[PDB]
Amino acid sequence: IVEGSDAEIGMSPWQVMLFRKSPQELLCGASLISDRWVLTAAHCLLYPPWDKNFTENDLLVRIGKHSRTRYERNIEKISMLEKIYIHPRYNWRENLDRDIALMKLKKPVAFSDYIHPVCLPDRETAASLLQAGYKGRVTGWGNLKEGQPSVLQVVNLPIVERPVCKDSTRIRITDNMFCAGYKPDEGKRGDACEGDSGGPFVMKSPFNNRWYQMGIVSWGEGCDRDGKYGFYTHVFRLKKWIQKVIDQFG
């Protein structure tokens, strides 16, 4: 995260860390959406252009974390993956279309003050909240500049109008995407950066005061450059596949 600030304890109890066993290190962001399911960005596991193809055995899930480096004794929980599920029409080849993945945990994690799942939007919330100017919030342990913080970072970011999104890049943008960030004119800045992918983009519903995960941290060209924006996977659009996967593989 670029131009963010330290999370408060318990601010983002759904935040997950995709961790490398060997050699141990931050791999990606992720979210808890159940006591057994973690949601993340497909490219976090599978991205052939960089010889990335991770399997279950290869990874650890650490929930309830504040600190990036420290093992948080009595607070954090680390879990083993029972199975990885990647979207069947994930476009790693071209534009990272359907950049989404589900990770079933081997055992349900115990909820606490530091660990609690986020909701997934319904059509109406989504219809209501995903609007140009509406601000969302993203969290992550990624670099702080186009680097490496001690604790979970947080930054609030306005959703941006689709034509701006499209006009800012050469990449073919899709309806499974939305982009976010301030314009160069708006003064304030900030953005996701390397290591934040898979992390959650959240909004708080003013209708029931719950936090919904509207987007997944997907891609950007540079970090926090002006004229550039963060691109996030549109969680509500790919929800069926998500229910489908849960409603059958557990």
Binding site: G10, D113, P117, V118, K135, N209, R210
Partner: peptide, 26 residues
């Protein structure tokens, strides 16, 4: 069911330092 409600915030009617920023954007 009880998703989106943080133990250390919503469940205690405490709110974090910048959520209102989001509320005001809506």
């Amino acid at each position: 069911a009880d998703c989106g409600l943080r133990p250390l915030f919503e469940k205690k009617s405490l709110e974090d330092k910048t959520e209102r920023e989001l509320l005001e954007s809506y």
